[PDB]
Design a protein around this ligand. Sequence first.
Ligand SMILES: Cc1cc2nc3c(=O)[nH]c(=O)nc-3n(C[C@H](O)[C@H](O)[C@H](O)COP(=O)(O)OP(=O)(O)OC[C@H]3O[C@@H](n4cnc5c(N)ncnc54)[C@H](O)[C@@H]3O)c2cc1C
Ligand SMILES: Cc1cc2nc3c(=O)[nH]c(=O)nc-3n(C[C@H](O)[C@H](O)[C@H](O)COP(=O)(O)OP(=O)(O)OC[C@H]3O[C@@H](n4cnc5c(N)ncnc54)[C@H](O)[C@@H]3O)c2cc1C
Ligand SMILES: [Cl-]
Ligand SMILES: [Cl-]
Ligand SMILES: [Cl-]
Ligand SMILES: [Cl-]
Ligand SMILES: [Cl-]
Ligand SMILES: [Cl-]
Ligand SMILES: [Cl-]
Ligand SMILES: [Cl-]
Ligand SMILES: [Cl-]
Ligand SMILES: [Cl-]
Ligand SMILES: [Mg+2]
Ligand SMILES: [Mg+2]
Ligand SMILES: [Mg+2]
Ligand SMILES: [Mg+2]
Ligand SMILES: [Mg+2]
Ligand SMILES: [Mg+2]
Lengths: 451, 448
Amino acid sequence: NAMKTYDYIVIGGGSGGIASANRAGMHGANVLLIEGNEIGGTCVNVGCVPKKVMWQASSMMEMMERDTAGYGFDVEIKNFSFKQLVENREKYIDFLHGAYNRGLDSNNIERIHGYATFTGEQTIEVNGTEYTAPHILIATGGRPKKLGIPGEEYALDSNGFFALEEMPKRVVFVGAGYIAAELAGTLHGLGAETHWAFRHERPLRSFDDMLSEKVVERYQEMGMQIHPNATPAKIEKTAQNEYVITFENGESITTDAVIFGTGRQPNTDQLGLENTKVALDEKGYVKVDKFQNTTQNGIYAVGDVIGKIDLTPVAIAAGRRLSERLFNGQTDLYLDYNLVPTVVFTHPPVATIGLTEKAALEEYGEDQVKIYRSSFTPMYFALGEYRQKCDMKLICVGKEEKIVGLHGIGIGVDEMLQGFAVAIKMGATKADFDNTVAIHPTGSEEFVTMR
Amino acid sequence: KTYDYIVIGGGSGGIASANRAGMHGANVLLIEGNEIGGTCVNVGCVPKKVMWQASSMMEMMERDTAGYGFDVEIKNFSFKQLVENREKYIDFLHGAYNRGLDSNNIERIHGYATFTGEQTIEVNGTEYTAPHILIATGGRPKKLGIPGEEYALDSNGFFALEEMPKRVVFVGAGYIAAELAGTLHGLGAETHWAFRHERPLRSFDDMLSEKVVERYQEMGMQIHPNATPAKIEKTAQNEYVITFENGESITTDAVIFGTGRQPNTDQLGLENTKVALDEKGYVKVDKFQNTTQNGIYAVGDVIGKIDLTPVAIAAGRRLSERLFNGQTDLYLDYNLVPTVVFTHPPVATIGLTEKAALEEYGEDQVKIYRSSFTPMYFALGEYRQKCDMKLICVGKEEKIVGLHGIGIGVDEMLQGFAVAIKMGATKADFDNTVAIHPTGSEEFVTMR
Ligand SMILES: Cc1cc2nc3c(=O)[nH]c(=O)nc-3n(C[C@H](O)[C@H](O)[C@H](O)COP(=O)(O)OP(=O)(O)OC[C@H]3O[C@@H](n4cnc5c(N)ncnc54)[C@H](O)[C@@H]3O)c2cc1C
Ligand SMILES: Cc1cc2nc3c(=O)[nH]c(=O)nc-3n(C[C@H](O)[C@H](O)[C@H](O)COP(=O)(O)OP(=O)(O)OC[C@H]3O[C@@H](n4cnc5c(N)ncnc54)[C@H](O)[C@@H]3O)c2cc1C
Ligand SMILES: [Cl-]
Ligand SMILES: [Cl-]
Ligand SMILES: [Cl-]
Ligand SMILES: [Cl-]
Ligand SMILES: [Cl-]
Ligand SMILES: [Cl-]
Ligand SMILES: [Cl-]
Ligand SMILES: [Cl-]
Ligand SMILES: [Cl-]
Ligand SMILES: [Cl-]
Ligand SMILES: [Mg+2]
Ligand SMILES: [Mg+2]
Ligand SMILES: [Mg+2]
Ligand SMILES: [Mg+2]
Ligand SMILES: [Mg+2]
Ligand SMILES: [Mg+2]
């Protein structure tokens, strides 16, 4: 009957929760981890992992259809089974569940399958029983928002996309963020007649202009239909087993599926926070200080639920550093949220870190900003007729030309960024790049040979 | 005639130095006896990378497509078309290099130069002089030196191929043999790789040499260690038999070798200068690329330092900045130069090997971080190719003195890490950089 006591209770078994629980357990803490759905959270089950698998498949189909002849190959794709692709993808995710469970076991983590709700400042309830600890981590992540139009029951969010076991012949993606950009490129590369509709002149408005421009340009060249200045009005199911999505501008598209990515919301509703001193912002995100402390001593928060940078490695690092602080005496340790690198898996991929050109100009002024810009055809395309471009930009500030932003779009940029992120975090200048000998022949060398 | 600068060799180093000199107003003469662009453009980095790409594409189609739900058939593979297309691209490069030389007012002569005096050279029976002369003549393949050597092909012979041998034996332990072996193996040839010692790639970190062999063996390449070539004989059925000193013999359609290169200094007329050569024939130079004779300089493969294109280019450019743009103290640092080897999968390396670090700093000052994982790319098929990474750290601060990796995508990962390492990155600098997920590159910043 008495509350079962632990040193640490982690609510949510996703990127942030698993990382924080494991690190606390490694340091000898008696840890309880609570997950209501599936171990691994969003990234493993309906996020980064399945997205990357599908991207890889779509890239493979594109390479085979377009780039093989130039290298002397006459290739025929006798069949493509989207169903088998999905089955293999899900079999890998099941394997990941096992890998994560073995990691948790190695760190002596005890787990509960169910949803937790606070019942006091240091007490939660799940499946009828109460548990208490002096340290509780909220790592509940987020979930998709609804489309909010008539016929939305016919549309699919990202979860709906992953639930697909057959590919639609025609599809309309609604949204301007990286999720819509990535998923649109995936079904398009796999052969669906693909439309991408977004509200303004351009999508990916938070990205550097070079990147938003080029993602659209590259997709448009390969045959994706772009519908800018398109606000959804309604989705109608017709008598012929198909849908018609109409926009406020009057245009319409007949399609087999509508997939939307119009924002996510934090999993703080029905968490019982009224029983704590944890404050939420207007959007429902948990307020935290630099140390991941909520407004109540004894409760912490990391990951998507705090509404800062919604990436798996951020949640992981925030969670690990938090456990080092609480259970390994690293009293002053915290995660720096500046200069976090991001890769977006468009076709080709995008790499970005630091400030956009417009943000740099606003912060430092035109007289203090110098932009280096490069555009070249990767050697990979030298033998075919399709000359896809790779575009790169370095944003430098002051006499010293300190790099405050680096952006690129092109084949292979997904693997080029990590090292440059290290150098930029260290305060790299244009001179530091220039003094590093190039590696030839690679696309990466173009970053250190810009004039 | 008289010029401000005479450049002997129209390869990576010579073109780079000549263009930079012309850009600064020097009257330049560049002499090239063969093809503009030298080794890298014609019979090196460029065609090597093109063939590697074709090889990787075939391996991908045959092995990795089923896992992603594709039933694919390679109906035909035309090595002849691949080479035609490759050479068409190289011809385009010739044109671009020539346009660049024209833009910098470089005069060119097609012929082989020989020194006749300390500041005078001869080409096509005519003499030319200049107060500054750059030797950028590069190197060439060594010969096998055994009976039947004429039946084998060096790397130049490999690029001269317009058709592929069905069965092939690669001879040599260096990166050239390693790369070419992987290329023909991925393109379908029954491939053997024979080298003199227990392992190849002996100048590379042990993790890299060991894994290159392991990865190749797993994919069906036949490895023959402790195999010193003895002879090659042509049989009555128009096939070759290469025999080694250990008694092994292999019947094959071609023997391709990479047993080292030698500097192009022997027919250069250096007896007419004060330019000294080392015991192997390399031109001796100081940190500023000065030969032992004032007025003559040398860059690139001919100096026997780091035989890479970007090194030759940077040495040549900086030399021209020093000689023609008053950058008196400018020189190229040859430490921490990054290298990528296009094996299958590729190899990335910068800094010291584990053994060199241990010898230099001592066991109690060296800490090694290792990572081994299966790239997600391979998660859906039966073949789980591994990616292996190593960070070599020194002292209490764990300064990174070496970084090594083998696996898919490492070819594009290295450049940025080289910048950080050149800046003096520590393990803490890597740890303090947020990872990018999902990528292979994140494993470099998350080792424990
Ligand atoms: C389509 C898509 C693609 C993405 N691609 C990438 C990418 O390529 N790279 C990248 O870095 N990031 C990517 N992300 C973002 C990444 O998935 C998230 O940033 C990350 O999953 C956040 O981790 P988290 O621990 O905050 O939340 P989650 O991983 O969402 O975990 C929260 C967990 O808590 C559980 N939960 C919620 N409430 C309770 C409760 N009361 N009790 C018990 N359990 C609860 C949920 O079931 C969930 O499993 C992507 C996201 C999406 C949607
Ligand atoms: C198979 C192979 C693959 C390679 N792959 C890579 C790689 O991926 N990355 C990399 O960085 N490096 C690579 N290299 C190395 C790179 O090609 C060389 O380091 C680079 O070409 C050296 O440039 P250089 O100017 O010193 O000599 P070269 O490029 O060889 O140029 C020397 C030129 O001088 C000419 N010449 C010689 N003597 C005379 C004379 N007396 N008069 C007139 N002309 C003369 C020759 O015809 C030649 O064109 C590779 C080399 C080979 C053989
Ligand atoms: Cl973990
Ligand atoms: Cl939108
Ligand atoms: Cl911008
Ligand atoms: Cl979204
Ligand atoms: Cl040049
Ligand atoms: Cl050998
Ligand atoms: Cl070697
Ligand atoms: Cl070693
Ligand atoms: Cl060699
Ligand atoms: Cl490979
Ligand atoms: Mg499942
Ligand atoms: Mg709300
Ligand atoms: Mg002139
Ligand atoms: Mg002979
Ligand atoms: Mg075959
Ligand atoms: Mg002669």
